[PDB]
């Protein structure tokens, strides 16, 4: 006997990796204001970001 087989395929893969420690980055758009009597120079605030 003698046989000749000719094949051809194709594949498609989609992946998705996720880090559970850093799953997103947050970006806060903020704005300062002054309700006192004097100006402030080189304004450097410290802010909390609270979820619950």
């Amino acid at each position: 006997s003698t046989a000749v087989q000719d094949s051809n395929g194709e594949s498609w893969n989609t992946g998705l990796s996720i880090n559970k420690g850093e799953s997103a980055y947050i970006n806060a758009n903020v704005r300062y204001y002054n309700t006192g009597t004097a100006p402030m120079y080189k304004v450097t605030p410290t802010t909390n970001l609270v979820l619950d």
Binding site: N19, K20, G21, E22
Partner: protein
Amino acid sequence: LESNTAGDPYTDYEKASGSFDKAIKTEARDPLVAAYPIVGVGMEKLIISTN
């Protein structure tokens, strides 16, 4: 014989006179009570992020 009786950064006159910082409690105005902060930290919650 001591310019700073209590051993703090302020002399006996500065304490007794009140010529130091104005946020110092008034008991620390006499030269035998030290103007001295007692600062401590306390934890309110701990958050874990699995890597």
